[PDB]
């Protein structure tokens, strides 16, 4: 039986992906952005596509976006089928890693720009299997590990091969041998070279500091990153995620090779459990992550800028008394104190870091101290730099420690 709903969702998504038309601040030479993005993926030989949720929302009365929001976990395989057909239509080179056999390429559909962000405290189990966006601060990030995505095995008593074994939350092995001349059930060796793995990384988040209702203990949630999204997040970073809210069973209680079952209530009667009863965690399976809280050559920096930004830089170097305008642009909330503003500019620009023939480094950074009465604008200078400068931090002399300063 084939799900006609899923097939029709696949058709609608496929049509959207190949012809969703828009362009801006130009004539109506519509970019057909996601077909062009498949071409961009082909040029850079990527393995993921980024989709704006609102673009689906406007498309075809929004029914597709409603469906993919509500019941994402049913419809994701159908979406990947549609994507695979579109990539065959416009970029068939991408269907393999691209004679020695190039494996089939996997595709990640990274949604972004969702209508709203739910808090960790808004996790509620009817939203299981639905696409959401979530936020919190990352407390730790796992080692990046290979998750067994699709598996291939060879039978112990005959060297036939089973392949494309879909994996549950347990490491899953075949139940029957494909060879009718063979008798086997459950005795296998994994063919590593044929099997398929995904880069995998669990990261744990906790409720945002300003959003905890009275400064109490925050609530926590486990988040899973896979593929190109792994290792983008960092501890202490404040991030927005989007992906699927999912249940995760106690895989030990479900029964796992080489491991005993683990020894409030779960659920029983299910054959795999026998006498046992199964419990579930809640986790977020993330497809896209971003934070909400250097170049050493001119060309490698400048080739990232837009033409109008290039014009801004050209106007800046053309305006040869720019040096004064920069100082007056420093700390705009603070009146006067031109000498401090000048020094702050020179600190942010820094000197040049140097290495000597004997290996001795000579310092590039500029260290400044601003001395004054506590009523003065002094702390607003610090909060300006902390609010403005990339890779900057703020702490107090009292209520900090030598450990928390250098390293613990």
């Amino acid at each position: 039986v084939d799900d006609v709903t899923g097939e029709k969702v696949r058709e609608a998504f496929e049509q959207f992906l190949e012809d969703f038309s828009v362009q801006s601040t130009d004539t109506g030479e519509v970019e057909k952005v996601y077909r062009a993005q498949i071409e961009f993926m082909k040029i850079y030989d990527l393995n993921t596509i980024y989709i704006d949720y609102q673009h689906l929302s406007m498309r075809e009365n929004g029914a597709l976006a409603m469906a993919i929001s509500e019941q994402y976990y049913r419809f994701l395989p159908f979406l990947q089928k549609g994507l695979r057909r579109v990539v065959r239509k416009y970029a068939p080179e991408l269907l393999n890693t691209s004679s020695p056999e190039q494996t089939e390429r996997v595709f990640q559909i990274s949604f972004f720009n969702l209508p709203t962000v739910h808090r960790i405290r808004d996790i509620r189990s009817e939203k299981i299997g639905s696409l959401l966006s979530i936020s919190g601060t990352v407390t730790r990030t796992s080692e990046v590990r290979p998750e067994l995505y699709k598996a291939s095995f060879t039978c112990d008593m005959c060297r036939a091969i089973v392949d494309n074994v879909e994996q549950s939350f347990k490491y899953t092995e075949p139940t029957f041998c494909p060879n009718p001349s063979c008798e086997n059930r459950a005795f296998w060796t994994l063919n590593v070279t044929r099997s398929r793995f995904l880069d995998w990384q669990k990261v744990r988040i906790q409720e945002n500091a300003n959003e905890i209702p009275t400064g109490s203990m925050p609530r926590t949630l486990d988040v899973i990153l896979r593929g190109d999204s792994v290792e983008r997040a960092k501890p202490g970073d404040r991030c927005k995620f989007t992906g699927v809210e999912i249940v995760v069973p106690d895989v030990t209680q479900l029964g796992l090779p080489g491991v005993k079952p683990s020894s409030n209530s779960g659920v029983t009667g299910l054959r795999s459990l026998g006498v046992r009863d199964l419990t579930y965690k809640i986790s977020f399976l993330a497809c896209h992550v971003i934070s909400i809280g250097n170049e050493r050559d001119q060309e490698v920096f400048l080739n990232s800028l837009s033409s109008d930004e290039i014009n801004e830089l050209k106007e800046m170097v053309k305006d040869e008394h720019i040096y004064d305008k920069l100082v007056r642009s420093i700390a705009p909330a603070v009146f006067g104190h031109e000498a401090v503003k000048k020094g702050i500019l020179l600190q942010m620009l820094g000197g040049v870091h140097k290495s000597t023939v004997e290996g001795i480094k000579l310092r590039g950074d500029i260290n400044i101290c601003v001395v004054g009465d506590p009523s003065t604008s002094k702390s607003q200078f610090l909060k300006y730099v902390v609010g403005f400068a990339p890779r900057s931090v703020y702490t107090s002399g009292k209520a900090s420690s030598a450990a928390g300063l250098t390293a613990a």
Binding site: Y280, P374, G397
Partner: protein, 595 residues
Amino acid sequence: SEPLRIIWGTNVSIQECTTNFRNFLMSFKYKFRKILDEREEFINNTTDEELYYIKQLNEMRELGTSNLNLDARNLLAYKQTEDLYHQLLNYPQEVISIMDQTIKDCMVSLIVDNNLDYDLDEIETKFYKVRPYNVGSCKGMRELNPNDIDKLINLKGLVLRSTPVIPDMKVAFFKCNVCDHTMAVEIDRGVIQEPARCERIDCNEPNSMSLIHNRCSFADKQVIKLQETPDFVPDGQTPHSISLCVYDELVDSCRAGDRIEVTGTFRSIPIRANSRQRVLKSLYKTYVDVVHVKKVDLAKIREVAAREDLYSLLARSIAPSIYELEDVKKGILLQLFGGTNKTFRYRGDINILLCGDPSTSKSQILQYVHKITPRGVYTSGKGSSAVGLTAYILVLESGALVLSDGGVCCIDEFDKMSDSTRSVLHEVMEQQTISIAKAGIITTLNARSSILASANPIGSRYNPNLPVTENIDLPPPLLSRFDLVYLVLDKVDEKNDRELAKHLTNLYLEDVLPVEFLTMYISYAKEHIHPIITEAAKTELVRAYVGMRKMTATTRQLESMIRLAEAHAKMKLKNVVELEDVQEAVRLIRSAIKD
């Protein structure tokens, strides 16, 4: 000649129970409750003659919300439903199933009787809950016994802590490994009724169905540790505690430190000797399975807003039991109003220090203000650690000041506090956040507290022949953090001492004053009044600061004047700052800055 639906073990007809409840869910008048209980003299037609639970169901339908709260005593007022109260208390699961289904049935009945355009599909989709409450006497946690084990009970207690939300499977989802056909199974008493063979007769393979975990459907569950209160214990021995299970949107209805009532069925379950076995321990675990919880307008506000004495009227109300000291009470009233905020840093706080002798009533004023404010804290500064006051160490937990985020922090004995702790309060008064950096812990911990310090001259008395700085012994720029600083002194004067003694001794004679209206008025002002500054305020702000600067002053006084003028402009719901607001802010500062 027909089958009968019976509540098992009871001989109660479910159909008769259903009709007996339906005929109360409609046609009940709230006057009948006043016939049942006390206050029968206060029957009033325009509030008691409504079909009260149809009034509820119609408002509930317009809001589209699943819950009907039901005081259990109302069942005893209506003649056809008196027995059903006892049936509820003794067999709550079945009667509550009946009541839930009847609420849903009545929602349908109302839209089809009115033949309304509201979606039948919405009502059919929606689950409906009754939440019965006020069951009876709140018998003690220590007193529960085996007779209660299936009854509805009601407990008063203190929440120690709660779990995160726990997913509970309500429907399993089974997919065929052979033919990919799917079927759904409702979980029965925690057991998955797994299909042994595939449903489709054209496939019918045995053991071919497998559970697709994330296509199953899940309810929400949460477990909370509820303690016997230390008030009710026989004090020589520990309080007890009980686990309670709370479900669906009742999850997170309460938090640690909440004193609550919980109404629910008492329950018991066995627990396994080893999870690898069916073997059970003889003595059951017990828990309460809750169905209701409880803790522990503008027309009136507009009427007061027009009064001419309103400044003094609100000022007297903060502490009419204490001597009238109305400059202190007016300054505190502005601290309760607060200023406004701008995100480009500054904050709309106000900060006050009560100096004066230790032999005066300022501590009692602080006590009343701590009661008045919505989310304040009270402590004292002698021996107060820079980390204990603020945040302490694994995890970092918030201290008193951080717990007072968004409210008044009262601190007594402030003059005795060490310079280290004052150095932490510097960035509270300057930035209203704590810029921590310790081993493993780096954070800017936001704590937006309007400090109300209470402080003393060094030694037993204030010296009237010296300024406040020379007396208090805290340095001048620390005093310049605060907006207002006051002297309240015990000096002998038979006029003031007679009138104070009269004012105090009048308390024993009598049988806006009340704090409930004061804190409501302050709250509504905070929700509604956010004054912008007019040029008539700007001119006096610039002028008055330049005056006291060549009296010798700092812009922190000017910023204080701005925040106070905005606070003053929250009176009379004025919502615009003008000259008079600046004049009073400046004038009260002239009372302070003289030093």
